[PDB]
Amino acid sequence: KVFGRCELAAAMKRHGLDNYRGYSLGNWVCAAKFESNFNTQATNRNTDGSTDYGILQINSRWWCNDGRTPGSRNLCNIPCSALLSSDITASVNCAKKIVSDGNGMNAWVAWRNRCKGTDVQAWIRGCRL
Ligand SMILES: O=C1C(Br)=CC(=C(c2cc(Br)c(O)c(Br)c2)c2ccccc2S(=O)(=O)O)C=C1Br
Ligand SMILES: O=C1C(Br)=CC(=C(c2cc(Br)c(O)c(Br)c2)c2ccccc2S(=O)(=O)O)C=C1Br
Ligand code: NA
Numbered sequence: 181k182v183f184g185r186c187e188l189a190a191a192m193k194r195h196g197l198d199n200y201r202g203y204s205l206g207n208w209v210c211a212a213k214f215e216s217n218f219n220t221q222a223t224n225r226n227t228d229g230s231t232d233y234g235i236l237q238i239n240s241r242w243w244c245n246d247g248r249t250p251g252s253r254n255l256c257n258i259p260c261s262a263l264l265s266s267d268i269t270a271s272v273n274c275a276k277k278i279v280s281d282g283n284g285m286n287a288w289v290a291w292r293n294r295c296k297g298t299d300v301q302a303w304i305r306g307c308r309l
Contacts, residue, residue: 181266183218183235185209186307188268193309195272201279205309206300207291208275212236213303214290220271221264234263234271236288243274 183191189209192198198205215237216222224232230241230249240246242253244260256274263271278287285291 181220183212183220183268185213185218185303186309188212188218188235189304189307189309191268192272195269197272197275198309200276201284203279203285204301206303207285207295208236209303210295210298210300211285211288211291214294215288220266220268223264231260233260235268236263236271236275237290238263238271238274238278243278 189205192208193205197208212218212235216235218235220235222234222237224237226232226239228241230239231246232239233244233246238244238256238260240249240252240260243256244258244263245252245254246260256277258270258274263274279285285296
């Protein structure tokens with residue numbers, strides 16, 4: 181499923197992502213735009229041999245199990261396949277685990293380079309929320 185910008189914002193808010201850990205909703209929409217262009221089925225290999233999955237391009241070295249990444253931790257306790265569903269629940273729950281501690285949304289390079297330090301509230305312009 182390729183979500184619309186506001187469509188995704190609304191689905192995220194139905195899972196309480198708005199202001200999760202202090203990150204306003206636009207941060208997550210901005211991250212999803214530049215990670216996956218809003219496509220839940222996006223998959224992309226990395227130079228370390230891990231792969232990123234789903235609308236937030238969550239990695240298989242640390243977060244999900246894809247059965248082919250040496251030394252994977254699966255800290256979200258989920259098959260990476262689950263992050264490709266049209267239902268964003270699994271991606272949201274894993275994103276919440278990622279942001280629960282550590283470097284927060286800095287786990288996403290795209291967030292750090294494209295979203296951090298900008299007015300991310302622009303990303304929910306014109307969205308009924
Ligand atoms: O900085 C990088 C970046 Br950027 C990409 C890549 C590669 C690559 C190729 C494909 Br195809 C692919 O799907 C992905 Br992901 C990466 C690559 C290129 C030539 C030979 C072997 C690889 S290898 O590393 O894949 O063996 C290597 C370095 Br170094
Ligand atoms: O030195 C190389 C060079 Br150059 C290319 C490639 C690859 C590759 C090659 C072709 Br051709 C291609 O069409 C695609 Br896509 C990827 C490759 C890259 C990453 C992962 C798997 C492959 S794999 O496909 O080789 O398993 C690996 C090495 Br090592
Ligand atoms: Na894995």
